Short mmCIF file of C-alpha atoms and ligand atoms in Angstrom, two decimals:
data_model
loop_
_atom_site.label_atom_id
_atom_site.label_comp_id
_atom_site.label_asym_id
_atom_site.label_seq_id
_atom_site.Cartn_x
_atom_site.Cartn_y
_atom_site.Cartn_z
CA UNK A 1 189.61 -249.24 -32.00
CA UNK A 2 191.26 -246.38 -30.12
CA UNK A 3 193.97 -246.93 -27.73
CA UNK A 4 194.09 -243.57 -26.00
CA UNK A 5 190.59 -244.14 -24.70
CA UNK A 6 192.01 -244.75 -21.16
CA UNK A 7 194.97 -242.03 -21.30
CA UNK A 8 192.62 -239.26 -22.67
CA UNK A 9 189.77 -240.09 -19.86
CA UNK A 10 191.02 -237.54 -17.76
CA UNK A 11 190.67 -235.03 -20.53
CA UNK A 12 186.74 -235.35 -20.86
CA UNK A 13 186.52 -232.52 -18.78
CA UNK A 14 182.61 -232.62 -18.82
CA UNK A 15 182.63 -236.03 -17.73
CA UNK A 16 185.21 -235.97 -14.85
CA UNK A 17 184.95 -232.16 -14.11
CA UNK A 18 181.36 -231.73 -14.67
CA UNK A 19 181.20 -227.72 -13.83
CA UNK A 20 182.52 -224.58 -14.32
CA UNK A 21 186.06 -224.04 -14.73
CA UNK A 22 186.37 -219.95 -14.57
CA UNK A 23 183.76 -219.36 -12.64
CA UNK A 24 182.33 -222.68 -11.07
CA UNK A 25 178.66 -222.68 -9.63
CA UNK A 26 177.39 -225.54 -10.77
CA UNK A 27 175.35 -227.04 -7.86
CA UNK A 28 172.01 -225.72 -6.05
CA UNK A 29 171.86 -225.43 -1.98
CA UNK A 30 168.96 -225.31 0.42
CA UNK A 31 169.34 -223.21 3.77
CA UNK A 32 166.45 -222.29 5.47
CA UNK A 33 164.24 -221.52 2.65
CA UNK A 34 167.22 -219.56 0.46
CA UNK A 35 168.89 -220.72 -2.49
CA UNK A 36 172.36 -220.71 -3.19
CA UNK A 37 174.66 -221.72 -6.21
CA UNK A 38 177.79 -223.74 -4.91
CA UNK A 39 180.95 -224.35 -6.73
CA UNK A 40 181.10 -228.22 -7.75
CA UNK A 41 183.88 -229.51 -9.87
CA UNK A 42 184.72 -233.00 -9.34
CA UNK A 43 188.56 -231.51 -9.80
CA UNK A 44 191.02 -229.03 -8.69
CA UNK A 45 191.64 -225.78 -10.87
CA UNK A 46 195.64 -225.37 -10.37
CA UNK A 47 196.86 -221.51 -10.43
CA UNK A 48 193.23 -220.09 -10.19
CA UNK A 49 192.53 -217.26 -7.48
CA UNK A 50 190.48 -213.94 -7.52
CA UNK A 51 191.34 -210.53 -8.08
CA UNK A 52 190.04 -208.00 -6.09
CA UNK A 53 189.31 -205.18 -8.49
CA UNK A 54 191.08 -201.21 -7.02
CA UNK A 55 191.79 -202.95 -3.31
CA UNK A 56 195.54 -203.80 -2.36
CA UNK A 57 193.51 -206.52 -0.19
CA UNK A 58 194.35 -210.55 -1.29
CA UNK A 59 191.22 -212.37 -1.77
CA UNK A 60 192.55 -214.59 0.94
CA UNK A 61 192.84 -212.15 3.89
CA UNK A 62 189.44 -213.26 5.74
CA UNK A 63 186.11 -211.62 5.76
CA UNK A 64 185.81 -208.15 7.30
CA UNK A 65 184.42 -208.74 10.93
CA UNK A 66 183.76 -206.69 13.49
CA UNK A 67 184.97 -203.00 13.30
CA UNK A 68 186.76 -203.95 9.97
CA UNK A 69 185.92 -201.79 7.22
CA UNK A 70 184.64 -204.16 4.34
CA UNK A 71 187.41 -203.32 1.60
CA UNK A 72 189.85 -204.18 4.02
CA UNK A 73 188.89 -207.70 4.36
CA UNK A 74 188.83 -210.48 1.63
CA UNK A 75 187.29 -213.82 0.80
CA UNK A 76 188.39 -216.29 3.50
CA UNK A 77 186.80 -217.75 6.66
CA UNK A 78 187.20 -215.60 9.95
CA UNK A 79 189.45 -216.77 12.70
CA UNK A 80 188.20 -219.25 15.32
CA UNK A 81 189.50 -220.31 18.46
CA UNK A 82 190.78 -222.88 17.61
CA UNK A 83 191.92 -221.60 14.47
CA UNK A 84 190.24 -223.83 11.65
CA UNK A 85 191.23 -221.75 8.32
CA UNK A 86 194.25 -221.39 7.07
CA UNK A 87 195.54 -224.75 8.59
CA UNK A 88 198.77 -226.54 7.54
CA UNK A 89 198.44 -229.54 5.65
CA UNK A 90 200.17 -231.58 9.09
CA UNK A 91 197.75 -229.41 11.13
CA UNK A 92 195.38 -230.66 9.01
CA UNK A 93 196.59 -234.66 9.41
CA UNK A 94 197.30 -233.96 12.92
CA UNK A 95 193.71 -232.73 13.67
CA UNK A 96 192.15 -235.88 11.27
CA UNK A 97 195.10 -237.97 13.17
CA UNK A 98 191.90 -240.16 14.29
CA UNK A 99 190.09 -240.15 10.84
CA UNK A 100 190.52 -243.33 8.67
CA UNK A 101 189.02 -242.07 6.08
CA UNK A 102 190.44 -238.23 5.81
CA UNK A 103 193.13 -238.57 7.70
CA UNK A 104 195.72 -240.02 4.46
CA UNK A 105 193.69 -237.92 1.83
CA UNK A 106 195.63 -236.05 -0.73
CA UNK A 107 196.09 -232.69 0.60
CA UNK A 108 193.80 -230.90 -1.81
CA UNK A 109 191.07 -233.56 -1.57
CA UNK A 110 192.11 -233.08 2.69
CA UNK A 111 191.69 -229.20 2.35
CA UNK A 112 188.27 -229.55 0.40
CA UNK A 113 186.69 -232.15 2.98
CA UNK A 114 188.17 -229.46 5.65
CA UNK A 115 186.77 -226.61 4.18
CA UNK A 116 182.92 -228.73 3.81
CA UNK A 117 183.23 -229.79 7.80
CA UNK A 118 182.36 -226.07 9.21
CA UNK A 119 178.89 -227.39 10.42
CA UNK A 120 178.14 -230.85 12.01
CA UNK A 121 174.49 -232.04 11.15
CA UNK A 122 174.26 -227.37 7.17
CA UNK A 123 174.30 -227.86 3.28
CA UNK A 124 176.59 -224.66 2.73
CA UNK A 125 180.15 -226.46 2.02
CA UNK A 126 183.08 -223.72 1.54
CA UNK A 127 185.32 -224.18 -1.81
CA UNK A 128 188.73 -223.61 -0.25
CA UNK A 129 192.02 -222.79 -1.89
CA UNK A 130 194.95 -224.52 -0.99
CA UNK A 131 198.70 -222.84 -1.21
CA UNK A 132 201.50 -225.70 -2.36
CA UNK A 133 204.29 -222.89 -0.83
CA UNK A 134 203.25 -223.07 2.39
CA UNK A 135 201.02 -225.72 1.66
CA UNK A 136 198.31 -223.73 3.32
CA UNK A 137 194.33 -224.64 2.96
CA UNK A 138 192.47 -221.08 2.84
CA UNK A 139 188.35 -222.02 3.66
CA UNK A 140 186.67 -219.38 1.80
CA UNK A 141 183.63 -217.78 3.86
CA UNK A 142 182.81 -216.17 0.13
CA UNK A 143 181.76 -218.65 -2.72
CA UNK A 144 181.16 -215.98 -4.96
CA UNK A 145 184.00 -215.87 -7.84
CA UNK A 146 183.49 -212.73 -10.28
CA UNK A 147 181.58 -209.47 -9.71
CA UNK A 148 182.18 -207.04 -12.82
CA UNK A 149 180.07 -204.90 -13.97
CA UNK A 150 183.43 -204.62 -4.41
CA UNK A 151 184.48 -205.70 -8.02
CA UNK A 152 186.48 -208.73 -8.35
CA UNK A 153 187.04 -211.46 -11.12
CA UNK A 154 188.66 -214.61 -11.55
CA UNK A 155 191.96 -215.37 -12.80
CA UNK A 156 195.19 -217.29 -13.14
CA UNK A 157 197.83 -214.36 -12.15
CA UNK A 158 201.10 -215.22 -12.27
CA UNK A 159 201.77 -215.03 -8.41
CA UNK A 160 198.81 -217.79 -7.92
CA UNK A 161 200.73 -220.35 -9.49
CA UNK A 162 200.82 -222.14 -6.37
CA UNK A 163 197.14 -221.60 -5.82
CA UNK A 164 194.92 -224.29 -6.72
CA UNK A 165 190.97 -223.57 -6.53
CA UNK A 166 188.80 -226.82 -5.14
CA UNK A 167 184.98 -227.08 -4.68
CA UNK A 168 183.58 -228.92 -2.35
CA UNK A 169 183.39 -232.09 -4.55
CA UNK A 170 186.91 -232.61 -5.48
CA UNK A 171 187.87 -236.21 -5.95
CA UNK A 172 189.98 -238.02 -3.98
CA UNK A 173 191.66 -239.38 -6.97
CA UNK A 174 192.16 -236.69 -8.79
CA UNK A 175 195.92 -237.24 -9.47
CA UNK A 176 194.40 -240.20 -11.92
CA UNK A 177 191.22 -238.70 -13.73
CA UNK A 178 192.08 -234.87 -13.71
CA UNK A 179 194.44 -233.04 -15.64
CA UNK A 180 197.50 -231.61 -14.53
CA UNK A 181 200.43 -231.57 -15.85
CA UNK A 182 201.01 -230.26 -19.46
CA UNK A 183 202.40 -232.26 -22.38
CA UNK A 184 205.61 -231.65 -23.52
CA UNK A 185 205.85 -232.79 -27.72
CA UNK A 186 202.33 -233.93 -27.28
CA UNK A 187 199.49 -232.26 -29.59
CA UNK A 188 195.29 -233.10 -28.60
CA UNK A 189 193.91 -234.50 -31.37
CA UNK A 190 190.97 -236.25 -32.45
CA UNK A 191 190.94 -240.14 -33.41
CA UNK A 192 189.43 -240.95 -36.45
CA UNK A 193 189.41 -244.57 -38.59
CA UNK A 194 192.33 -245.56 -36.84
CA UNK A 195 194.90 -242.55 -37.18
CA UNK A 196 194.95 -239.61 -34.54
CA UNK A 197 193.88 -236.35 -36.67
CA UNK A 198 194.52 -232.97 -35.81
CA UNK A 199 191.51 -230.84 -34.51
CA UNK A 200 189.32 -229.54 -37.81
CA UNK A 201 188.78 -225.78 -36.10
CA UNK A 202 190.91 -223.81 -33.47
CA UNK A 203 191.17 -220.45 -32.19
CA UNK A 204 194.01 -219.25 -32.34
CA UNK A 205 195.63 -216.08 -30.22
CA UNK A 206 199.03 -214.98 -29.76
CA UNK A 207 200.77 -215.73 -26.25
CA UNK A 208 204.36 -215.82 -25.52
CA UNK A 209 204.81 -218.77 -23.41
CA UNK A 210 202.77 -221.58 -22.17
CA UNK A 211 201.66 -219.76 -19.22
CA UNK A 212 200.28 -217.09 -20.96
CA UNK A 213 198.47 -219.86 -23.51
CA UNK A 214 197.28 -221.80 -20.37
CA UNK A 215 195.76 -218.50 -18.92
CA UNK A 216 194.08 -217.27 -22.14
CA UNK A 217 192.42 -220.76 -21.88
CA UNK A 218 191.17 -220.36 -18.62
CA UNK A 219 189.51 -217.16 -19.53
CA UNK A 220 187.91 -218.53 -21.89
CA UNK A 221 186.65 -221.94 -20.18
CA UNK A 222 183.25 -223.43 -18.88
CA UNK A 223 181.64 -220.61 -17.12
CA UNK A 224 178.90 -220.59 -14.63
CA UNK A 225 178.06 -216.68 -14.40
CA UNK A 226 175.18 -214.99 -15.71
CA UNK A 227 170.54 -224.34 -15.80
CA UNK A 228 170.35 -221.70 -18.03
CA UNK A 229 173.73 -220.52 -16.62
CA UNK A 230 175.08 -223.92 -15.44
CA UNK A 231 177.97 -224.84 -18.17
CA UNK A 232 178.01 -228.59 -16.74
CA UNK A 233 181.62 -228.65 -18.04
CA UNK A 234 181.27 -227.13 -21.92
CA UNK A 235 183.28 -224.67 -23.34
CA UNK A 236 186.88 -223.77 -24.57
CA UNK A 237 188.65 -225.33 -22.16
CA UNK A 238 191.96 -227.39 -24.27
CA UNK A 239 194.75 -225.37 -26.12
CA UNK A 240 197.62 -226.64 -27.91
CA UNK A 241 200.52 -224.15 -27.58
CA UNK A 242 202.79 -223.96 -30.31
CA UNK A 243 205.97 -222.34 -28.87
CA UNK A 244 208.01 -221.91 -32.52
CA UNK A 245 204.89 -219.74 -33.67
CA UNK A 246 203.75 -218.84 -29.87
CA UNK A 247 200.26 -220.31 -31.00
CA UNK A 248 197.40 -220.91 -28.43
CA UNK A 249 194.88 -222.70 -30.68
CA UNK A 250 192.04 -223.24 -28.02
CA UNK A 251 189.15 -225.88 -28.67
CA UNK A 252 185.94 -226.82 -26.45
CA UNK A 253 185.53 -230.39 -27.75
CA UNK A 254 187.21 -233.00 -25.97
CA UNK A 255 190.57 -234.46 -27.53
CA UNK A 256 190.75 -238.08 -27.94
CA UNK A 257 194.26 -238.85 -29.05
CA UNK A 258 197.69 -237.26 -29.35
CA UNK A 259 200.04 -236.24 -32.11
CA UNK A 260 203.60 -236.51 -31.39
CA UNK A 261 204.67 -233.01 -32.68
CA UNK A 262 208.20 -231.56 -30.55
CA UNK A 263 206.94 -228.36 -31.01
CA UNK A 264 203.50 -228.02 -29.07
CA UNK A 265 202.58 -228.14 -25.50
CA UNK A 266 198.89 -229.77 -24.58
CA UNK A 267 197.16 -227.56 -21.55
CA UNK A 268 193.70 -227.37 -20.69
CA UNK A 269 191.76 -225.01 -18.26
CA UNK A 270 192.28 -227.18 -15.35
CA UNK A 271 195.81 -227.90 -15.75
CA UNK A 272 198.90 -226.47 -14.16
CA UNK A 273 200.19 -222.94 -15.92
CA UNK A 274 203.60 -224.09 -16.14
CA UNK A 275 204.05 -227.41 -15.08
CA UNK A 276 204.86 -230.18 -17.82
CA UNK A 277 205.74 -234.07 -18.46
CA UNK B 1 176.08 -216.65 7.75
CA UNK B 2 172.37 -215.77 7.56
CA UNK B 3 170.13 -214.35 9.17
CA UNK B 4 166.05 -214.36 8.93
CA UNK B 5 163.13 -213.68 10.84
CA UNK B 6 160.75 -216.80 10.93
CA UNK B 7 157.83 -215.79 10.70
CA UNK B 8 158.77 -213.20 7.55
CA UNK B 9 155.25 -211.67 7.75
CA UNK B 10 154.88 -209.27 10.39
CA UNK B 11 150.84 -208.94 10.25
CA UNK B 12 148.88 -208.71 13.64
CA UNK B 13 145.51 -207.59 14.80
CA UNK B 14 144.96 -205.52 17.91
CA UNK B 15 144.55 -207.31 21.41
CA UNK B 16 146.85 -210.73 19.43
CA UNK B 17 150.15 -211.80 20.50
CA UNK B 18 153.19 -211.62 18.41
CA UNK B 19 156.43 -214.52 18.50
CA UNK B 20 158.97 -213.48 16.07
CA UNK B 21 162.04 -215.71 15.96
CA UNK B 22 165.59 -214.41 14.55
CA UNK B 23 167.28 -217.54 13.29
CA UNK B 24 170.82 -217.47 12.45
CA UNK B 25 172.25 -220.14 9.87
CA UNK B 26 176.32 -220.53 10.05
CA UNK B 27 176.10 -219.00 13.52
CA UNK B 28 180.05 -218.41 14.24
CA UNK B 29 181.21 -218.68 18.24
CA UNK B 30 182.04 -215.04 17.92
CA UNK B 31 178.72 -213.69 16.59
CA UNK B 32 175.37 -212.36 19.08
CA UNK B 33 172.05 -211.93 18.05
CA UNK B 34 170.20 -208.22 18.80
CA UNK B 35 166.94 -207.26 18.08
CA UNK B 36 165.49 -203.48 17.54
CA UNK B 37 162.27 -201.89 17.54
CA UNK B 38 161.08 -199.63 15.45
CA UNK B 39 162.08 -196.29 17.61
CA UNK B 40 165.41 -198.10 17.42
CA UNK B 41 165.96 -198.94 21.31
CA UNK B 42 167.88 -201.87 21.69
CA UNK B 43 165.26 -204.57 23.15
CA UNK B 44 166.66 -206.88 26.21
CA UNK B 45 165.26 -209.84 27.45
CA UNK B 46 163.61 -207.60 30.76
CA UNK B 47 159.92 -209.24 30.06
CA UNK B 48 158.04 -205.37 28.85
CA UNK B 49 155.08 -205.80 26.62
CA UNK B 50 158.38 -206.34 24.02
CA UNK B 51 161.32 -208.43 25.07
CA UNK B 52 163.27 -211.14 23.94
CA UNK B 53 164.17 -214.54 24.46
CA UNK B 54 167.56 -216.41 23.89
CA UNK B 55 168.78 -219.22 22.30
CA UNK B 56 172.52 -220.59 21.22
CA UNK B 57 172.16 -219.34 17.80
CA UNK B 58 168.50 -218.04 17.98
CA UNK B 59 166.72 -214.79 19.04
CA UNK B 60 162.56 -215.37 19.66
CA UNK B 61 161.02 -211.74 19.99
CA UNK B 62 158.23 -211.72 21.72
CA UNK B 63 155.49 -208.59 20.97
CA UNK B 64 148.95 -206.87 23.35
CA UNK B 65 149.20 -205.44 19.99
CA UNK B 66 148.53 -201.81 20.13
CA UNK B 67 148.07 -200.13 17.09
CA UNK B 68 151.20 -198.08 17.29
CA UNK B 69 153.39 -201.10 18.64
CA UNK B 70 154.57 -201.13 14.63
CA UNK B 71 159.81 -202.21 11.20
CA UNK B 72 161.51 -204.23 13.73
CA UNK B 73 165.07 -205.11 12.90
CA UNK B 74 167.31 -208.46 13.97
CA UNK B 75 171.43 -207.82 13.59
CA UNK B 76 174.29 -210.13 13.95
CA UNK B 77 177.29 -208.44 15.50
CA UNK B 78 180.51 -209.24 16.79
CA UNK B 79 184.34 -208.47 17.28
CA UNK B 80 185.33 -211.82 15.07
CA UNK B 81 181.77 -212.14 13.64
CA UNK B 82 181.80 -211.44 9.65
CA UNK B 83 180.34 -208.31 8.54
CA UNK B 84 178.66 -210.05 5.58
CA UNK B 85 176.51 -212.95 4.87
CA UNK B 86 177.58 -215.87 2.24
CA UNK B 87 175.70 -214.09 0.01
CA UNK B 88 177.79 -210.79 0.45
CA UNK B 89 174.64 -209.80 2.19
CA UNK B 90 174.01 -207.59 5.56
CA UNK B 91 174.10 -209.59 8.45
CA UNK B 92 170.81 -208.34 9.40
CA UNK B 93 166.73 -209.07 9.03
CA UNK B 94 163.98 -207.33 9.11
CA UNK B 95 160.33 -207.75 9.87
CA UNK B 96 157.09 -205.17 9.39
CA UNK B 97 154.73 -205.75 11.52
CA UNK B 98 150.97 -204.55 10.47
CA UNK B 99 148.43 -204.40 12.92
NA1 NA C 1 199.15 -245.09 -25.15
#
């Protein structure tokens, strides 16, 4: 019948995400007797970090400790002797050196089992961000994503391109079922009686490049902020970017085919803001 | 990190005694464990009526009974230890005790 079936698997983002995209909390945690909502994506959300509202603080400086006033700390874990957050991705091999199983993991899949490895038993695994520039993994003490209403929010800004956001469930195959990369002269589409259609109903807003498109559809992906609250994956999280018209038509049904068309650009919540085959 | 007070319910009659253990989930290598009294003297593990017992990651008050014995207060300081909880929480607990 249809013969993207297998290509367009990784773009079933309920099924092989299965969380929140903006803000992911999609799993419950026990510790002593208190509950806590845990980011739980099966994949990694590339240029996604966290804006500290009126502070000139990253979100990855670590938490305040000590004397530290509060606003001048950020998100990530506190130094430790030895250090275990931020560690290098050969820090990270080197420590795992005896490891079978962790040692040769990708490094984002390597930086999330890091980042869940803080206590040896104990439920409470950190989501971590992991830097491709200095290829960096960041353990974040804070799970906590957006806070508006000691503000801070989500969000793909340009300078965390190299930033890629990963819970603590993050597959180790992501490169295969996940998205990534964006489609150059590809448009999503939906198959239907043998011919790929185009999607009946878009929404479409104005952006003047692909990066803007891709971050307009991040903004407006599966959310997890208030079951009730738990997206489980649903919501607007494709766009096909027209760059002749600067189009971001955004959709939150899952494509199932593609339309060659040389003038769009397919890009979805999860993928890269820039990157493209 | 977090911090609570096992047995939440401070509520004790006159001539009882009182355990009150200060458990500390996440406990980092940098972190220590301090309990208060109501006044707000700094308890120490010198056996008084009140004192304190210690444990890697663990606090047990011990509190006998007088009627004016009663909000007690466990904290979690340090120079590296984070000044928040997971739950952008105080790093502290604290437990009423009713006689
Ligand atoms: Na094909």
């Amino acid at each position: 019948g249809n013969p993207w079936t297998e290509y367009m698997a990784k773009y079933d983002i309920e099924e092989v995400h299965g969380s929140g995209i903006r803000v992911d909390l999609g799993e419950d945690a026990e510790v002593a007797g208190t509950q806590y909502r845990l980011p739980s994506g099966k994949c990694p959300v590339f240029g996604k970090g966290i804006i500290i509202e009126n502070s000139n603080t990253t979100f990855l400086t670590p938490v305040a400790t000590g004397n530290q006033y509060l606003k001048d700390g950020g998100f990530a874990f506190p130094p430790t002797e030895p250090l275990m957050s931020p560690m290098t991705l050969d820090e990270m091999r080197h420590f795992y050196k005896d490891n079978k199983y962790v040692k040769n993991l990708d490094e984002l899949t390597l930086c999330s089992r890091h980042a869940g490895n803080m206590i040896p038993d104990s439920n409470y695994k950190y989501p971590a961000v992991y830097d491709d520039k200095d290829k960096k993994c960041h353990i974040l003490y804070i799970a906590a994503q957006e806070n508006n209403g000691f503000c801070f929010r989500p969000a793909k800004d340009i300078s965390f391109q190299n930033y890629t956001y990963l819970s603590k469930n993050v597959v180790d195959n992501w490169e295969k079922v996940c998205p990534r990369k964006n489609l150059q002269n590809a448009k999503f589409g939906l198959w239907v009686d043998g011919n790929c259609e185009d999607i009946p109903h878009v929404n479409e807003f104005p952006a003047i490049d692909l990066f803007e498109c891709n971050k307009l559809v991040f903004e407006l992906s599966a959310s997890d902020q208030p079951d009730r609250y738990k997206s489980h994956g649903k919501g607007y999280n494709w766009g096909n970017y027209n760059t002749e018209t600067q189009k971001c038509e955004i959709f939150n049904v899952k494509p199932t085919c593609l339309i060659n068309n040389s003038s769009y650009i397919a890009t979805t919540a999860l993928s890269h803001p820039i990157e493209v085959e | 990190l977090q911090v609570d007070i096992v047995p939440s319910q401070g509520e004790i009659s006159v001539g009882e005694s009182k355990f009150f253990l200060c458990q500390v989930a996440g406990m980092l290598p940098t972190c220590e464990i301090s309990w208060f009294s109501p006044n707000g003297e700094k308890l120490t593990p010198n056996q008084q009526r009140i004192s304190v017992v210690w444990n890697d990651d663990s606090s047990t008050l011990t509190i006998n009974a007088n009627i004016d014995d009663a909000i007690y207060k466990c904290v979690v300081h340090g120079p590296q230890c984070p000044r928040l909880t997971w739950s952008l929480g105080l790093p502290e607990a604290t437990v009423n005790v009713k006689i």
